[PDB]
Ligand binder design. Structure first.
Ligand code: HEM
Length: 148
């Protein structure tokens, strides 16, 4: 595949400042779906507003965790199945936190938003398509975490 290098090359820019870029992702996420804000429970309390989350060291640590998992997916873009068991457990964890299957689509849109804003003219339709495919594979693995 050639869209693997598309992924690697587009990730390079954002991966140098992962907290700054992940902050865009989460600000976008809460703008689109405010009901995700209460899922964070640090110190047994709920954030009132999205800007409250940005003041929380624990919340910012989670942004770094998110960006590191995406980095693992990019690293293994030609061979994701290697992350399947890890992602299944990560999905199970998030289901327990309260994330629902539908919310992963909003996370996906927030990731694409953050890439679009960072890459500008370099966010080509092929780049969008490559990322949608990679993210979709990640969500498919995480969704194995759920049970029916
Ligand atoms: C609606 C979206 C999300 C919500 C509400 C959410 C919430 C949480 C919460 C409450 C925790 C436990 C506290 C913590 O460790 O900070 C957690 C852990 C974690 N999250 Fe998320 N998260 C979301 C999205 C993501 C995404 C997209 C990723 C990676 C692609 C991710 C990766 C992780 C990791 C690696 C942990 C630590 C898991 C562990 O304990 O082993 N999260 N998340």
């Amino acid at each position: 595949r050639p869209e693997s290098e598309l992924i690697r090359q587009s990730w390079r820019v954002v991966s140098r400042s992962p907290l700054e870029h992940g902050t865009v992702l989460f600000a976008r996420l809460f703008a689109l779906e405010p009901s995700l804000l209460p899922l964070f429970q640090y110190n047994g309390r709920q954030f009132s507003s999205p800007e409250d989350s940005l003041s929380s060291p624990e919340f910012l640590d989670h942004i770094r965790k998110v960006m590191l998992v995406i980095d693992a997916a990019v690293t293994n873009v030609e061979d994701l199945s290697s992350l399947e068991e890890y992602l299944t457990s990560l999905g199970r964890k998030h289901r327990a936190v309260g994330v629902r299957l539908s919310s992963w689509s909003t996370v996906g849109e927030s990731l694409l938003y953050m890439l679009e804003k960072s890459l500008g003219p370099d966010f080509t339709p092929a780049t969008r398509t490559a990322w949608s495919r990679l993210y979709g594979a990640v969500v498919q693995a995480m969704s194995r975490g759920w049970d029916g």
